[PDB]
A paper describes a structure:
Enteroviruses particles are composed of single-strand RNA (virion RNA) genomes encapsulated by an icosahedral capsid of ~30 nm in diameter. In this study, we genetically perturb this equilibrium in a non-enveloped virus, enterovirus A71 to determine its structural basis. We isolate a single-point mutation variant with increased particle thermotolerance and decreased efficiency of cell entry. Using cryo-electron microscopy and molecular dynamics simulations, we determine that the thermostable native particles have acquired an expanded conformation that results in a significant increase in protein dynamics.
Numbering used by the authors:
A (entry chain B): 10 to 254
B (entry chain A): 1 to 297
C (entry chain D), I (entry chain D): 12 to 69
D (entry chain C), G (entry chain C): 1 to 242
E (entry chain A): 150 to 248
F (entry chain A): 51 to 149
H (entry chain C): 1 to 49
The structure:
């Protein structure tokens, strides 16, 4: 926890100083969460720690020709990312999160982003003629990687849903003009009390640059984007298979 | 003996408070002064104001009751049930005397929403829902003339077998509820309970006795032609043989006790298929009627 | 009496209760103003406090 | 038989009614619904959640779809010209058709399509300048200059430290919307307008970009309500829906 | 069998038997055989003001006296208001005249 | 463990059941088991023939007419139940007649 | 006639309903039922009464029908091989189809087919040895060795003075059983398994027999319930039933 | 069916009667009528003006 | 009042009682929680006693 464990670096590309930018709404870790109920002969347990620290996946770069990127959960919690030592064994999973997005730029750049979390974000793929009613949902697209993937048509959100009405979900406006911080908290969202470690992927994270990035020649042409997450209140259990030892 | 323990994740202080019941608003606020009121005094124009408060004839006095309109109508036609008010014609089952559509009298149909794109549009504003259901049945000849005849209706719960021929014992059964009524009688009003195996309607692995969900290895989401085994319907013509009149049956579905969760942006593309919201990725269209310029209308 | 969800579990506290009645005098599932388990309108200690003067520390 | 009376309203069928239902499966108890968050209580509280609004709805192609949302405020002319205008009709056409408020208006007949809006500026950090925002009440012509628009109601924006502004529209009802006993005889419709004027030129230090982009928002508050539930008519179909 | 339906003000006009306005969902409809007793029914107060008075009350567009922006024609159905519609149930014509 | 019984026994601070009140949980009683009403008798009356020429037709209560029903009913030795009956008459082509 | 209303739901007929009946013999009083013991109150308490379970269901002839019930534990190999495995599906096929719990499961759709079992040993008096019993949770492969099976959950039996052991199965529900909108498209079904491993060889003094036989039982407890009464489908008919 | 009696006055139609009506639009609340002066209470007070 | 079985004999004590009613307000044969002959839930003096220590006499 704190800011150290294995990863102790606290200085990104601009090597910034002078305190941090968080802007807290809640009161410093507002309590634990529930356990719910079930209707079968299964029951999970808790792994406590080693998942309670912070994590900083790779930094994607913003350019003028950018279109936006998205992530799927808990795809990045698996081996597809830093973790993967306690994610592919068990069967049940559920957790909150403390997602923090930190950007950085000089005072001469312009542009503005938009963060949003869409629960049960099922992509309708690129489509456009790929006639599929129900044959085989893809796995090479819905799980790109911990790096995310650039969008094709952000206006229709590559699914047919308009981008304009996105702000219904929780969202913040990353504006290069004034601030660079973005802290969001997402509780557990699922119909069933507990989820599986399989193709029942939870909410997806969306980041779309609405205001295009621009500047004058001679300055830095690319602005990095940092992604951090903190799995509040996670669990792991459930396993039964062939020959055991 | 024990050396390791750590959970934390807690906060202490002003969690909850006193327990009261005072569902009545009172005069709140008044006024506060700032500075010299001017138009172009230098910092910002178009300054603000404030009020105190009042709530109809309940709060404060009740000396005069001057509403905006002298009680024209009701003011709550906006709830979820109000939205889901009508009962649209969902099923249009057709029974000819002879032909290829339904030659053997039997006709199988199942509940769905993709039959009406408008209904699907209206129903897909959310993610999770929980509602009851009702059904009404009207039978008439293509020329609209009642005839003397008896009909057999039956509901089929999820996972039950499919009666294919008129001679199928599934028509007999004992577990599948059935309804018998002559068509000259009034229509057959009926209700259907909440038949989902979870707390909200959501597809994927919910049908078939076998497996499901994404990335199949152990199951097919086909089940032959009746994909996604769920609440379906069946209908015969009562008789050891064929009937003497053509029939055109109709369905009327109606929600009741509707509760939604997790709204999402509605839609901005034409629907393509069932259970797979694709779109015209090469024929992407705008949303509103575009105008010529921005300076002028 | 009172049932928590219907049989054992929790969550359908004030959502689902009872079943039905006769075909002439029937009812449905809802809540009342008297005879609850616990009124949830108890909070809001502060309503107007000081107008503007909170903390000009910097 | 019983001391009853023949009832001259039965045997019929109404599509917007209710009555004694009939359950089919007595031995049943559906899964008890647990409390999942995000439960929506009313079709409202979707009519006052901020949603970005397109005004520069000039492009109609596919790639250039993006800049329908925002419009430029570059520094070429900076004294007395106009930026853009629009109407306040939610469910007819144009801007409000793209937001959620207009989408919900497309399901009723008694609408407002009005009240507060919001403008978020994307100047780099060092841009200064003042914009004039004015509103014209219904049954009035748009001013031909900035001075005329200055009268009535208006507000002067700035770029020093504002980065936001929330103008509010009043609500007024005087005339008859539509009293058509038949269609094709009356074509009398009008509404107030909103305009944006260049107050001062767009100042910028040597080194910062020239063109910025102002975005616009849309929302309402707790005064107006929708009414007269009518069936929406659309073209969101393709015929071939297997 | 017969099909009745009420049409609220401002709703479109079903012209042909094939018009989807016959289907709809928002326009209330009534179905009853003619051998059954008559169809008693009620209609609420549908005016947009506190009393019945014509002029600018119909059409989605403008109205009142001295037209410049609207026609009080709406084609043949002048003054769009509470109207009625009636069909003969059937994919084809019927076998009896009706009054 | 120690013990607890729903929201009745011990506290009632939180009501977290396994499922948020999906349906009823007692479709297992004896009546629930014996729920439907199966087609037991299929008496047939022709206009002429050999089955029932003289109109009369005699039938008696039994269970062996349905092997499945006999299977379901022979799990016990002693039983005590009431009975009900409903009768539907139709032509082989399914057309009501005045009689 | 009476101030009534025509009811648009009557004149019909439902097969799963009830209402005002009609007795035919008023002058009747059936024999008053005395209290005869063994009165069954619910279809349950047949789902937790012990019933022997067949696992060695290899034979299909008539004379050899007996040893379908029990299986040998003779001493030929005694270090690391497997005895037998099965599934936990009550009402599909195989073992549980023979007991009473599966027979009752064949009348519903929401089953478990799980929980406690029991093994009774028939060694003479002087047989010693240890058996390894392990359970694999759903969505997992059966271990390829005894060491892997040792992990997770397991129990080590013995023959000194045990003559009995009662392993219990937990209950877990995560995925979707069957969400078929139509049949023939999905074939995704899986369940946890149970295995028996030779821990140590089968010791025996010189004079006692070599082959013994372990029997197995089956029962449940008061946690799980059956649901969704559906009509059972069988072939227990011969057509000619006079 | 129910312990009723066949009623020898039903199935008819009277032009000067009333009974159980049937509203068609449940989600409706007409404009609340404000007090406009000159409200006439009876067909009289026109017979003595 | 109360009838033992129906007329004279015993055995149908809480099994069969009363006959029937009108076609609109009818009833059936069952038992209540108040007004019984005698509650049969009276036993179970011991519930947990000593944990294990009963009698290691041999
Ligand atoms: C397999 C079909 C859906 C594939 C996934 C796309 C979106 C996933 C969430 C929506 C689909 C399931 C949730 C329920 C949506 C609609 O309200 C239901 N059809 C209700 O009838
Ligand atoms: C446009 C038609 C009327 C033109 C003006 C002539 C007289 C104006 C006042 C009377 C007309 C509207 C007020 C209502 C009169 C009748 O009571 C209504 N038709 C009631 O159905």
């Amino acid at each position: 926890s704190d800011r150290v464990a294995q990863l102790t670096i606290g200085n990104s590309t601009i090597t910034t100083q002078e305190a941090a930018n968080i802007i807290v709404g809640y009161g410093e870790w507002p309590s634990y969460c529930s356990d719910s109920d079930a209707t079968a002969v299964d029951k999970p347990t808790r792994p406590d720690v080693s998942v309670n620290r912070f994590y900083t996946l790779d930094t994607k770069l913003w350019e003028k020709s950018s279109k936006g990127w998205y992530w799927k959960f808990p795809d990045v919690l698996t081996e597809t990312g830093v973790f993967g030592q306690n994610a592919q064994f068990h069967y049940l999973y559920r957790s909150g999160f403390c997602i923090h997005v930190q950007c950085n730029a000089s005072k001469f750049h312009q542009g503005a982003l938009l963060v949003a979390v869409l629960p049960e974000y099922v992509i309708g793929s690129v489509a456009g003629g790929t006639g599929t009613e129900d044959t085989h949902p893809p796995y090479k697209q819905t799980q790109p990687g911990a790096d995310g993937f650039e969008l094709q048509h952000p206006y229709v959100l590559d699914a047919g849903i308009p981008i304009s009405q996105l702000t219904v979900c929780p969202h913040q406006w990353i504006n290069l003009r004034t601030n660079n911080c973005a802290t969001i908290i997402v509780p557990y969202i699922n119909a069933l009390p507990f989820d599986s470690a399989l193709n029942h992927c939870n909410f997806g994270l969306l980041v779309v640059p609405i205001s295009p990035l621009d500047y004058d020649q001679g300055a830095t042409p690319v602005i990095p984007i940092t992604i951090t997450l903190a799995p509040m209140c996670s669990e792991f259990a459930g396993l039964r298979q062939a020959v055991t030892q | 003996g024990d050396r390791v323990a750590d959970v934390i994740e807690s906060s202490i202080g002003d969690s909850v408070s006193r327990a009261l019941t005072r569902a009545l608003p009172a005069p709140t606020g008044q006024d506060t002064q700032v500075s010299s009121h001017r138009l172009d005094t230098g910092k910002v124009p178009a300054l603000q104001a404030a009020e105190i408060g009042a709530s109809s004839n309940a709060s404060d006095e009740s000396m005069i009751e001057t509403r905006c309109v002298l009680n024209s109508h009701s003011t709550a036609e906006t709830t979820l049930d109000s939205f889901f008010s009508r009962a649209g014609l969902v099923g249009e089952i057709d029974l000819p005397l002879e032909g290829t559509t339904n030659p053997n009298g039997y006709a199988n149909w199942d509940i769905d929403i993709t039959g009406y794109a408008q209904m699907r549009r209206k129903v897909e504003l959310f993610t999770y829902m929980r509602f009851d259901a009702e059904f009404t049945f009207v039978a008439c000849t293509p020329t609209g003339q009642v005839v003397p005849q008896l009909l057999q209706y039956m509901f089929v719960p999820p996972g039950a077998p499919e009666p294919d021929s008129r001679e199928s014992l599934a028509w007999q059964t004992a577990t599948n509820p059935s309804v018998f009524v002559k068509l000259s009688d009034p229509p057959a009003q009926v209700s259907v309970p909440f038949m989902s195996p979870a707390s909200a309607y959501q597809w994927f692995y919910d049908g078939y006795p076998t497996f499901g969900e994404h990335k199949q290895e152990k199951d097919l989401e086909y089940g032959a032609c009746p994909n996604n085994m769920m609440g379906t319907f069946s209908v015969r013509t009562v008789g050891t043989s064929k009937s003497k009149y053509p029939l055109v049956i109709r369905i009327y579905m109606r929600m009741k006790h509707v509760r939604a969760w997790i709204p999402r942006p509605m839609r901005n593309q034409n629907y393509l298929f069932k259970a797979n919201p694709n779109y015209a990725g090469n024929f992407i269209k705008p949303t509103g009627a575009s105008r010529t310029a921005i300076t002028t209308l | 009496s009172h049932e928590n969800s219907n049989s054992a579990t929790e969550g359908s506290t004030i959502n689902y209760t009872t079943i039905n009645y006769y075909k002439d005098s029937y009812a449905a599932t809802a809540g009342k103003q008297s005879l609850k388990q616990d009124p949830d309108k108890f909070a809001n200690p502060v309503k107007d406090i000081f107008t503007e003067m909170a903390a000009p520390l910097k | 038989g019983f001391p009853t009376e023949l009832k001259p309203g039965t045997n019929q069928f109404l599509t917007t009614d209710d009555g004694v239902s009939a359950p089919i499966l007595p031995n049943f108890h559906p899964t008890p619904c647990i409390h999942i968050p995000g439960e929506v209580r009313n079709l409202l509280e979707l009519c006052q959640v901020e949603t970005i609004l397109e005004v520069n709805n000039v492009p109609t192609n596919a790639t250039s779809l993006m800049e329908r949302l925002r419009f430029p405020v570059s520094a070429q002319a900076g004294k007395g010209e106009l930026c853009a205008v629009f109407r306040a009709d939610p469910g007819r056409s144009g801007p409000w058709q793209s937001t959620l408020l207009g989408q919900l208006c497309g399901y009723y007949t008694q609408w407002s399509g009005s009240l507060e809006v919001t403008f978020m500026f994307t100047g780099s950090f060092m841009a200064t300048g003042k914009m004039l925002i004015a509103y014209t009440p219904p049954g009035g012509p748009l001013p031909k200059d900035r001075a005329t628009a200055m009268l009535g109601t208006h507000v002067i924006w700035d770029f020093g430290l504002q980065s936001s502004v929330t103008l509010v529209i009043p609500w007024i009802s005087n005339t008859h919307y539509r009293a058509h006993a038949r269609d094709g005889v009356f074509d009398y419709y009008t509404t107030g307008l909103v305009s944006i004027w260049y107050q001062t030129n767009y100042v910028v230090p040597i080194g910062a970009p020239n063109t910025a982009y102002i975005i616009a928002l849309a929302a309402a508050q707790k005064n107006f309500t929708m009414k007269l539930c009518k069936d929406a008519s659309d073209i969101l179909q393709t015929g071939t829906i297997q």
